[PDB]
RNA sequence: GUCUCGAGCCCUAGACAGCCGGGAGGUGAGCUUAGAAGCAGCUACCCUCUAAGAAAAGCGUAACAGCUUACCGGCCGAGGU
């Protein structure tokens, strides 16, 4: 099979072996696509995805380097955008962000601060009772997003009583 | 401004409950042209656009209460 | 050959002398 | 999990899925009941408008409301089940 992918005008992508740079005005993303007799190649102002085998294993990864590419192409230009909300019920939390990490304080009332590092070029904006994680590498946006939500995580207790926590308000 | 359909058929009838099962159990009756003077009534509240198939809804609730044509 | 897609056609056929493929089909006729 | 072979059916008059839009009136059917208005129960389950739209398939409410399913239309475009 053979998938051809039209790159924007915005966008301009260089490639070496199996790594592919994206490049565009919210950024830059460089990702590794290898899997078995794939090949992924840049044709002037194409990016071509394929392959000389049509079994199911193979598309099922053809199918996921499309998407990969598709989502750096929003990347450099859009960007990615998660918005969360941080809610409370008896103690006010502290949500801040000091240096490259986004630190939680007095959660369920805790002494010590509960902290998660941000990945990558991901920016983390805080507006009050409003958080927005953005950047142009979906995956690092995506987990620095998810890391927030799990950073709150319990266990120990009911979940449906203790609902305190920063929470994935808004999904791209 | 116009009262429901239901209401005016226990008007022009003299009977006012229904009956346990319709259709196999006849209560009511009604004429030809005892049904074509509630149909001169409605007509915002009614989609048709003739009267022939303004008269057709309101059979649409008769022979499924106990009322007989004549 | 659907049986209602011909008596469609034939139906919007018969409002032009007196879907949007069932439209473009009978302005073809 | 993956490979291979057969059968039926659907499809460029646009299939399968997804997303958007519509999902309307007589009427909130009748009986029951303080009330019950798709949706507690019983019975019926009828016709207008129309491109569709159940006397309502599933949640939801004290009852409404509200959310969608059926069904119809659009975007999409190649196989689908
Ligand atoms: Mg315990």
Same mark, same amino acid.
């Given at each position: 099979?053979?998938?051809?992918?039209?790159?924007?005008?915005?966008?301009?992508?260089?490639?070496?072996?199996?790594?592919?740079?994206?490049?565009?005005?919210?950024?830059?993303?460089?990702?590794?696509?290898?899997?078995?007799?794939?090949?992924?190649?840049?044709?002037?102002?194409?990016?071509?995805?394929?392959?000389?085998?049509?079994?199911?294993?193979?598309?099922?990864?053809?199918?996921?380097?499309?998407?990969?590419?598709?989502?750096?192409?929003?990347?450099?230009?859009?960007?990615?955008?998660?918005?969360?909300?941080?809610?409370?019920?008896?103690?006010?939390?502290?949500?801040?962000?000091?240096?490259?990490?986004?630190?939680?304080?007095?959660?369920?009332?805790?002494?010590?601060?509960?902290?998660?590092?941000?990945?990558?070029?991901?920016?983390?904006?805080?507006?009050?009772?409003?958080?927005?994680?953005?950047?142009?590498?979906?995956?690092?946006?995506?987990?620095?997003?998810?890391?927030?939500?799990?950073?709150?995580?319990?266990?120990?207790?009911?979940?449906?009583?203790?609902?305190?926590?920063?929470?994935?308000?808004?999904?791209? | 401004? +116009?009262?429901?359909? /239901? %209401?005016?058929?226990?008007?022009?009838?003299?009977?006012?409950?229904?009956?346990?099962?319709?259709? &196999?159990?006849?209560?009511?009756?009604?004429?030809?042209?005892? +049904?074509?003077?509630? /149909? %001169?009534?409605?007509?915002?509240?009614?989609?048709?656009?003739?009267?022939?198939?303004?008269?057709? &809804?309101?059979?649409?609730?008769?022979?499924?209460?106990?009322?007989?044509?004549? | 050959?659907?049986?209602?897609?011909?008596?469609?056609?034939?139906?919007?056929?018969?409002?032009?002398?007196?879907?949007?493929?069932?439209?473009?089909?009978?302005?073809?006729?």
């Amino acid at each position: 099979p053979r998938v051809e992918l039209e790159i924007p005008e915005d966008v301009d992508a260089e490639q070496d072996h199996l790594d592919i740079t994206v490049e565009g005005d919210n950024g830059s993303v460089t990702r590794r696509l290898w899997y078995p007799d794939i090949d992924v190649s840049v044709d002037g102002d194409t990016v071509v995805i394929e392959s000389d085998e049509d079994n199911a294993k193979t598309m099922s990864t053809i199918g996921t380097f499309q998407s990969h590419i598709e989502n750096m192409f929003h990347g450099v230009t859009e960007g990615w955008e998660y918005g969360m909300e941080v809610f409370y019920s008896h103690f006010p939390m502290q949500v801040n962000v000091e240096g490259d990490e986004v630190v939680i304080e007095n959660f369920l009332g805790e002494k010590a601060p509960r902290r998660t590092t941000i990945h990558g070029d991901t920016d983390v904006e805080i507006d009050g009772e409003e958080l927005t994680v953005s950047g142009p590498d979906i995956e690092a946006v995506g987990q620095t997003a998810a890391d927030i939500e799990q950073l709150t995580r319990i266990n120990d207790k009911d979940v449906r009583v203790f609902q305190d926590g920063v929470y994935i308000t808004r999904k791209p | 401004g +116009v009262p429901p359909t /239901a %209401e005016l058929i226990k008007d022009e009838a003299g009977f006012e409950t229904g009956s346990g099962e319709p259709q &196999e159990d006849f209560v009511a009756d009604l004429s030809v042209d005892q +049904v074509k003077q509630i /149909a %001169e009534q409605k007509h915002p509240d009614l989609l048709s656009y003739d009267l022939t198939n303004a008269a057709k &809804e309101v059979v649409g609730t008769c022979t499924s209460l106990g009322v007989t044509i004549e | 050959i659907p049986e209602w897609k011909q008596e469609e056609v034939d139906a919007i056929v018969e409002m032009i002398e007196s879907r949007n493929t069932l439209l473009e089909r009978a302005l073809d006729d």
